[PDB]
UniProtKB/Swiss-Prot annotation:
Gene3D superfamilies: Glycosidases, Oligo-1,6-glucosidase, Domain 2. Catalyzes the reversible phosphorolysis of 2-O-alpha-D-glucosylglycerol with retention of the anomeric configuration, forming alpha-D-glucose 1-phosphate and glycerol. Has most likely a catabolic role, either regulating the intracellular levels of glucosylglycerol, which acts as a compatible solute, or degrading it when the environmental conditions change. Cannot catalyze the phosphorolysis of sucrose or glucosylglycerate. Its EC number is 2.4.1.359. Keywords: Carbohydrate metabolism, Glycosyltransferase, Transferase. InterPro entries: Glyco_hydro_13_cat_dom, Glycoside_hydrolase_SF, O16G_dom_2, Sucrose_GGa_phosphorylase-rel, Sucrose_phospho. One of its GO terms (biological process) is glucosylglycerol metabolic process. The gene is gtfA. This is Glucosylglycerol phosphorylase. Disulfide bonds: none annotated. Belongs to the glycosyl hydrolase 13 family. Sucrose phosphorylase subfamily. Optimum temperature is 37 degrees Celsius. Full activity is retained after incubating at up to 45 degrees Celsius for 10 minutes, while only 46% is left after incubating at 50 degrees Celsius. The protein is completely denatured after incubating at higher temperatures. GO terms for molecular function: 1,4-alpha-oligoglucan phosphorylase activity; glycosyltransferase activity.
Length: 470
């Protein structure tokens, strides 16, 4: 897998289709990116393809499989394996309803009547997305009432991992996708899949790791890399690094938001000393910033400083089990549209060990739009605005976006990152990150209280060290 800036993007949000994205990606980002994580295409009733009827298909409006294949041929390809759940509209679920209890698929779906009568203590013990019980009374064709357990939307149905049919549905999905050339696959919400009474049912030790390893092994024979995603204390991300499945850099976005807010480099630098390896490093993402990803990394005093100095166009936060659970804003509006601060943030991300991943609304320095969110009624939709290609053109004609593009291209192009990372000494208000591969060497220095981003690099054609201000 190549060490170049990637791109998380939608099949339909930019352009009218996947090919339209290909036209723009070839026209620009051809030299800047080298990878592509495309949010799901396959037909879904809920969560933007997070609940597909099947991974074995591509929705027609978004595009055709061959267009996805063309992306696979040119760049790296990452797509979502919703290992936790499948659609109710999905045929295997439909067959189970038609056959009622007597279906091969039904054994694969989890049933809550199997657990006996759950205690109130055991009930409260469960890790909760929303404040209704994670259950689903199904209307069978038989005219009978049964209960399946699902974590997210009712249309999504959780598939338990005590039936090997779960692992086998997985393996067929992985087979199709890795054949289509997907370099990497992200295991969506892996922790939720383990379920036990008297247990949180999220990230349960060590079965969740065992389930992850089996999926990873099938992918490795497949040749597709695994990027399981979890929103929990970084220690779980470190465990994923030990597994060799790639960890996510969920801690760095709020860490950098604080560090830029207060002009404070200390916690960022400790994290850099000890960050997990094989990480893929985000700033702006298609979800919000689920705060528990920064806890421990940033003190509660500083998380409170950040959350307060947020409250002001800027973030909106919805919390179910916490005073703040998540905050939804475009990263640009998180930094109050200050483009020097945003450039420093992207540079720091790129010098962070791991594979940097820029988001589309981030790449076009997009400001959040309330109106798309209001019609949807979805929070995260302020970070998921639709782009037309001429909107694209005029937005890449912005100075901040062109600076960003210069930055993205250099990080993918430069030899030194392929070497070792050495973080340098600096004061508590600035940061110094260096890469040294062989003769090649590059060096990011950011002043956080002035937002100045100076990179010194050695270029073989010159044969001499050179200094530029990205
Ligand atoms: O399916 C629900 C969730 O699954 C996981 C994905 O990362 C989320 O984007 C999605 O909302
Ligand atoms: Li690996």
């Amino acid at each position: 897998l190549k060490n170049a800036v990637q791109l998380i993007c939608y099949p339909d949000r930019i352009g009218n289709n996947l090919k339209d994205l290909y036209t723009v990606v070839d026209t620009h980002l051809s030299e800047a990116i080298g990878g592509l994580h495309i949010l799901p295409f396959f037909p879904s009733n809920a969560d933007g393809g997070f609940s597909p009827l099947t991974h074995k298909e591509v929705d027609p409006k978004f595009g055709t499989w061959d267009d996805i294949e063309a992306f696979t041929a040119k760049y790296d390809l990452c797509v979502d394996l919703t290992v936790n759940h499948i659609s109710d509209e999905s045929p295997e679920f439909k067959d189970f309803i038609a056959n009622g209890f007597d279906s091969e698929y039904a054994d694969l779906f989890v049933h809550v009547d199997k657990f006996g009568e759950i205690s109130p203590d055991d009930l409260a013990l469960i890790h909760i997305r929303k404040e209704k019980e994670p259950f689903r009374e199904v209307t069978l064709a038989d005219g009978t009432k049964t209960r399946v357990w699902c974590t997210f939307t009712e249309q999504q149905i959780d598939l338990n991992y005590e039936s090997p049919l779960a692992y086998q549905l997985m393996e067929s999905y992985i087979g199709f996708l890795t054949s289509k050339g997907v370099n990497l696959l992200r295991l969506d919400a892996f922790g939720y899949t383990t379920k036990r009474i008297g247990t949180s049912c999220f990230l349960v030790e060590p079965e969740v790791y065992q389930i992850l390893d089996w999926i990873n092994q099938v992918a490795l024979k497949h040749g597709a890399e695994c990027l399981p995603e979890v929103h929990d204390h970084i220690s779980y991300q470190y465990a994923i690094s030990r597994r060799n499945m790639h960890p996510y850099g969920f801690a760095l976005p709020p860490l950098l938001l604080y560090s830029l807010l207060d002009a404070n480099s200390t916690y960022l630098k400790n994290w850099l000393r000890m960050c997990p390896r094989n990480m893929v490093t985000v700033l702006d993402t298609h979800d919000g910033i689920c705060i528990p990803d920064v806890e421990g990394v940033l003190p509660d005093e500083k998380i409170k400083v950040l959350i307060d100095n947020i409250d002001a166009r800027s973030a909106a936060n919805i919390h179910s089990v916490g005073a703040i659970y998540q905050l939804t804003c475009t990263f640009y509006d998180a930094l109050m549209q200050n483009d020097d601060a945003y450039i420093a943030a992207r540079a720091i991300q790129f010098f962070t060990p791991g594979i940097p991943q820029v988001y589309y609304v981030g790449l076009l320095a997009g400001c959040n739009d309330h109106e798309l969110m209001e019609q949807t009624g979805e929070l995260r939709d302020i970070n998921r605005h639709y782009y037309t290609l001429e909107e694209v053109e005029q937005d890449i004609q912005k100075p901040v976006v062109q600076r960003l593009l210069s930055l993205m291209k250099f990080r993918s192009n430069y030899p030194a990152f392929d070497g070792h990372f050495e973080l340098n000494y600096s004061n508590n208000s600035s940061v110094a990150m260096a890469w040294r591969h062989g003769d090649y060497y590059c060096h990011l220095f950011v002043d956080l209280n002035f937002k100045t981003v100076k990179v010194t690099y050695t270029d073989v054609e010159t044969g001499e060290t050179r200094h530029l201000e990205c």
